[PDB]
């Protein structure tokens, strides 16, 4: 969950409020939809989407079960508005 994911990740909810029908396919299935993006998606990770406005998306995306370590550039990158993996 570095800096360049985390770009990715802004890019995909970025074509979401511009993009209804991409929109409505990451919600309906975010794993079909990660997977067009070239990101792994791990059966062991949840995933969940927690605003689907015209305006604003928020796609929440846990860490792999492969995570490193991040820099503080790294977890400033991260968006501070999501949520974690379910326990």
């Given at each position: 969950?570095?800096?360049?994911?985390?770009?990715?990740?802004?890019?995909?909810?970025?074509?979401?409020?511009?993009?209804?029908?991409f929109?409505?396919?990451l919600?309906?299935?975010?794993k079909?939809?990660?997977?067009?993006?070239?990101?792994?998606?791990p059966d062991?990770?949840?995933?969940?989407?927690?605003?689907?406005?015209?305006?604003?998306?928020?796609?929440?995306?846990?860490?792999?079960?492969?995570?490193?370590?991040?820099?503080?550039?790294?977890?400033?990158?991260?968006?501070?508005?999501?949520?974690?993996?379910?326990?």
């Amino acid at each position: 969950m570095n800096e360049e994911q985390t770009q990715q990740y802004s890019q995909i909810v970025a074509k979401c409020w511009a993009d209804a029908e991409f929109k409505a396919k990451l919600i309906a299935d975010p794993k079909a939809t990660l997977a067009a993006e070239s990101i792994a998606v791990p059966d062991g990770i949840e995933l969940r989407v927690l605003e689907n406005t015209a305006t604003v998306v928020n796609l929440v995306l846990p860490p792999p079960p492969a995570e490193g370590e991040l820099s503080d550039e790294d977890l400033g990158a991260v968006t501070g508005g999501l949520t974690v993996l379910p326990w």
